[model samples]
Target: TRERILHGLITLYILKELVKRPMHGYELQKSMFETTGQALPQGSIYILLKTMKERGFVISESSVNKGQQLTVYHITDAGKKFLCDHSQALQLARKIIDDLLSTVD
Candidate 1:
């Protein structure tokens, strides 16, 4: 229970969003909220994004638009593989969770 609930699917969700297209941190956050109605803390998202960037799964570029600077992230090819693996893992996890729930009294 601890392990499963501790490490939630934030990574998978982030990658999934990035696969759609490049987005600034705020846009990504809003997109996630819109899709899942879940709002992860902004700090956590930035930390994860930085970690993923260090792992070579994604890249970021900064630009100024309308006098404001924005850092946008784009998924790399490696990120696609990462996304695929995580997607499969989530599917398997869902199956296990569902099966376990079915056994609950």
Candidate 2:
């Protein structure tokens, strides 16, 4: 009897991708969509950029004169720890989550 990792789930994703290497907002969601499409809300996904930016985990970075239309983001030390926190949280819940999955499949 347990369930979590919604906002935090999205948080893990963006930070993980950036942790791999500074990538564009498009790459984050686009690659995610191709590899795996979760239930994250379409509109809220964009808000992720704003949310992480403010939280200081993820920050905006684009060319000086590239284009305001698209945005790029990168991670910091704090972001790394936060990403670890995400992992720990999910790890703790993995048992329950796996139980749910096992029940189905």
Best by lDDT: 1
Model 1: lowest-lDDT 10 consecutive positions: 1-10
Q: Write the per-residue lDDT of candidate 2 for residues 2-103, one digit (tens) a residue.
A: 124566676787888888898876677787787676444565566777878888887776665544465678898899998887687666687788888888
Model 1: per-residue Cα lDDT over 2-87, one tens digit each? 24453346766778888888888888778878997978775667887887899898899998887887899999899889878767
Q: Quote model 1's TM-score.
A: 0.76
Task: State each model's C-alpha RMSD to the native.
Answer: 3.6, 4.0
Clashing pairs in 1: none
Clashes of 1: 0
TM-scores, all candidates, are 0.76, 0.74
For candidate 2, give the lDDT.
0.74
Candidate 2 wrong stretches, greater than 4 Å: 1-4, 39-43, 64-68, 101-105
User: What C-alpha lDDT do the candidate models reach, one value each?
Assistant: 0.79, 0.74
